[PDB]
Design a protein around this ligand. Structure first.
Ligand code: QPP
Ligand code: QPP
Lengths: 278, 277
């Protein structure tokens, strides 16, 4: 509930192009006039507490693999979230264009996510919405770090039970699954059928897509995609797993099958459609 | 109307001692924890316009005006973070000085002219300039001075609309006090005082003004002019020879001025606020 008097955000930042536009908000590229440094600024009309309490928590979050919230401004009519600019694109586009892709690349990505999420957990924060579409590269560099910016929901949430930090560990297992075959472990006929399958937590390592994948990777995922949240790995536990901390992650090229599956399964991007706008 | 999410002011500053307590507020010495820099923080409960006024203040940036660095708000309080000045009150310095001249008074009025001229360019009328709110930045002997009823201009009493001219009158009044140690208008019965102020009837009384230059008296006459349309602006006052030239005398007048200060300004509102409860 603490504030200070600021100037007009238009006097502090030069608003350049719109990056994307949503149902209720808009994200603009903004240059800080004093420094020339660039930020992505989310502009939210107030006409759209709770959000005031939520956004204060985000301000506290400082981690190398999480997009930083650098400031929140307020006018009578709007909120402005000054966010760290990342310019490396979406995870799925990178993998598809990559040329070579292996278990070590997947494990390198999952290791950074576990670090980010384990930091949130220590800080007392459950993300609740972890999914590969909101994983963005920091920069266009080949070796760039990854940044955190219905089929993914944990069984205990479907089962109307109170959520915990375990919910996020489930989501990390689903992300690990997709990073190694390019499709989701649970997919609908009806949302009815999908719900019942997540509740039972019945999924496969299906042939042929999973035949080249190590037992170690599969073990890793079974410990995160565990139905019972009390049996499921924490982030700290998962980060000690040999697939992450050891040398069991294979270095075979699986790009061909993974890329084809992503093309089929992740052919629509909400970033792209926010850009396509109004 | 523009604000940023901030942290608890007490997480950014260590609040040390209370410097003073008023009817409605408290000033507390505070150390910025990241820097070790000291500020004077005015804490005002919301349980007692002011939004608009505070905004203007944050824009005021001049070396001879106490700066407003930041304003914090909690659900119940406003916290004005102010530049700390530590040289004490003008009147106390003069009284303890040992030696005091027209050159000293003129140096002091030159600074105030520069500060008030800046306020005027920025579109701001002070409206309450008085020597009791002039404080020294530091204890150094050559410290700059800082801006932090018998002083009010004739047109204000004449129930006319105030302009910037009002501050220039106040500078004349300050210049007068600085050269003799007593106010140009005083009467036990303020029916008579009102009439003297309305008519701008004051003296250069003897013997106190005997050793003062005709140049000083001429400068005050142009500032303490009854008609705001005939009265000097700060820009014009600053170009007067007593300010910009060398008509300011180098004769010690501390004896008479200090005696008069001791008689006329024995009470301090800063000391009263300190004394507290
Ligand atoms: C949360 C966030 C997003 C960004 N960057 C970003 N974000 C978007 C973006 C696209 C669609 C909706 C919202 C944001 N587009 C971009 C294009 C080119 C470079 C960066 C970029 N930085 N931080
Ligand atoms: C507006 C302002 C006041 C001050 N300083 C200050 N202010 C006071 C002060 C005294 C009484 C009421 C309000 C403030 N007392 C002080 C004592 C010793 C050093 C500095 C000091 N700095 N900025």
């Amino acid at each position: 509930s603490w504030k200070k008097q600021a100037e007009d955000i238009k006097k502090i930042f030069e608003f350049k192009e719109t990056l994307g536009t949503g149902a209720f908000s808009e994200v603009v590229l903004a240059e800080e006039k004093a420094t020339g440094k660039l930020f992505a600024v989310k502009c939210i009309p107030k006409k759209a507490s709770s959000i005031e309490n939520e956004i204060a928590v985000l301000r506290k979050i400082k981690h190398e693999n999480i997009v930083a919230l650098e400031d929140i401004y307020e006018s009578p009519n709007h909120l402005y979230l000054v966010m760290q600019l990342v310019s490396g694109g979406e995870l799925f586009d990178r993998i598809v264009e990559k040329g070579f892709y292996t278990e070590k690349d997947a494990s390198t990505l999952i290791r950074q996510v576990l670090d980010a999420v384990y930091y949130l957990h220590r800080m007392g924060i459950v993300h609740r919405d972890l999914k590969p579409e909101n994983l963005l590269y920091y920069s266009q560099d080949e070796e760039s770090k990854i940044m955190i910016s219905p089929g993914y929901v944990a069984p205990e949430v479907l089962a109307q039970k109170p959520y915990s930090k375990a919910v996020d560990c489930w989501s990390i297992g689903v992300i690990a699954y997709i990073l190694l075959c390019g499709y989701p472990p649970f997919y609908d006929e009806n949302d009815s059928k999908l719900f019942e399958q997540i509740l039972k937590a019945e999924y496969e390592f299906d042939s042929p897509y999973w035949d080249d994948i190590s037992d170690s990777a599969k073990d890793f995922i079974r410990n995160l995609m565990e139905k019972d949240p009390n049996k499921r790995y924490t982030c700290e536990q998962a980060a000690r797993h040999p697939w992450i901390a050891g040398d069991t992650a294979l270095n075979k090229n699986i790009h061909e099958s993974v890329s084809a599956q992503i093309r089929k399964n992740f052919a629509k991007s909400k970033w792209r459609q926010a850009f396509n706008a109004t």
